Amino acid sequence: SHCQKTSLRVNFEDIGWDSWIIAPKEYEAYECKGGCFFPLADDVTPTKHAIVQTLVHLKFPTKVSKACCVPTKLSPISVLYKDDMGVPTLKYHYEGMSVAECGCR
Amino acid sequence: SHCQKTSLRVNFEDIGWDSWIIAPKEYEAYECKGGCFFPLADDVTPTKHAIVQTLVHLKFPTKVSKACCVPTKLSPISVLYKDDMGVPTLKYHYEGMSVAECGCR
Numbered sequence: 693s694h695c696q697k698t699s700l701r702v703n704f705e706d707i708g709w710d711s712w713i714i715a716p717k718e719y720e721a722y723e724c725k726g727g728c729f730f731p732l733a734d735d736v737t738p739t740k741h742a743i744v745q746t747l748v749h750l751k752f753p754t755k756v757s758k759a760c761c762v763p764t765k766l767s768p769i770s771v772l773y774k775d776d777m778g779v780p781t782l783k784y785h786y787e788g789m790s791v792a793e794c795g796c797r
Numbered sequence: 798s799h800c801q802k803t804s805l806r807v808n809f810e811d812i813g814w815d816s817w818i819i820a821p822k823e824y825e826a827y828e829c830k831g832g833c834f835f836p837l838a839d840d841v842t843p844t845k846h847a848i849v850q851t852l853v854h855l856k857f858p859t860k861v862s863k864a865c866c867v868p869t870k871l872s873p874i875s876v877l878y879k880d881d882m883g884v885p886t887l888k889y890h891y892e893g894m895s896v897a898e899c900g901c902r
């Protein structure tokens with residue numbers, strides 16, 4: 693239905709990061725999934741440009757794409773990584789790794 | 798090619814806003830168009846979650862969508878609008894109406 697946060701468990705080996713991220717093996721990154729269509733749910737905050745673009749898409753669907761459901765706020769995680777020197781070091785707040793909020797943009 | 802700002806001229810009559818926005822008739826809203834794929838251009842700032850999701854999409858294309866090219870910063874415009882009382886009033890900075898920057902999210 694509407695744009696919302698859903699589960700996405702990410703494995704660092706599968707994306708080629710295990711050479712440098714020791715632990716954890718996986719983490720919950722989440723993803724934003726769903727449509728950007730009218731009517732909109734009242735528990736989410738849209739931008740005016742996303743509203744305008746969605747309306748323009750309705751009138752000219754071949755020429756203008758619809759707004760996209762994307763992460764609008766991100767949260768950090770902690771990773772145990774391999775530094776340039778190669779020693780296991782803790783990165784306490786590795787920013788931007790997990791979805792906090794979703795929204796149409 | 799890559800995610801970038803392109804022209805999108807929006808007509809308020811075409812989107813049903815002319816009942817309340819008197820002037821201007823049209824304005825340059827811009828849109829964000831292009832792909833979110835590796836390698837990425839060095840004149841843009843990606844988020845870690847968008848990078849991770851794009852990598853996961855490559856490994857599992859049917860299960861996880863790619864990051865989306867969206868506006869990451871918006872600019873205001875000035876509109877002459879019809880207030881509840883119905884008198885033409887200037888809104889000097891109507892926020893969020895035009896694309897300032899694009900990015901993969």
Ligand SMILES: [Cl-]
Nearest residue numbers: 730731732733
């Ligand atoms: Cl609505």
Ligand SMILES: [Cl-]
Nearest residue numbers: 737738795796
């Ligand atoms: Cl939204």
Ligand SMILES: [Cl-]
Nearest residue numbers: 739740892893
């Ligand atoms: Cl806005």
Ligand SMILES: [Cl-]
Nearest residue numbers: 768770784785
């Ligand atoms: Cl803490």
Ligand SMILES: [Cl-]
Nearest residue numbers: 783784785786
């Ligand atoms: Cl930290």
Ligand SMILES: [Cl-]
Nearest residue numbers: 835836837838
């Ligand atoms: Cl790259």
Ligand SMILES: [Cl-]
Nearest residue numbers: 842843900901
């Ligand atoms: Cl980007």
Ligand SMILES: [Cl-]
Nearest residue numbers: 787788844845
């Ligand atoms: Cl980030």
Ligand SMILES: [Cl-]
Nearest residue numbers: 873875889890
């Ligand atoms: Cl000014």
Ligand SMILES: [Cl-]
Nearest residue numbers: 888889890891
């Ligand atoms: Cl204002």
Ligand code: NA
Nearest residue numbers: 752753754755
């Ligand atoms: Na069309």
Ligand code: NA
Nearest residue numbers: 857858859860
């Ligand atoms: Na797949």
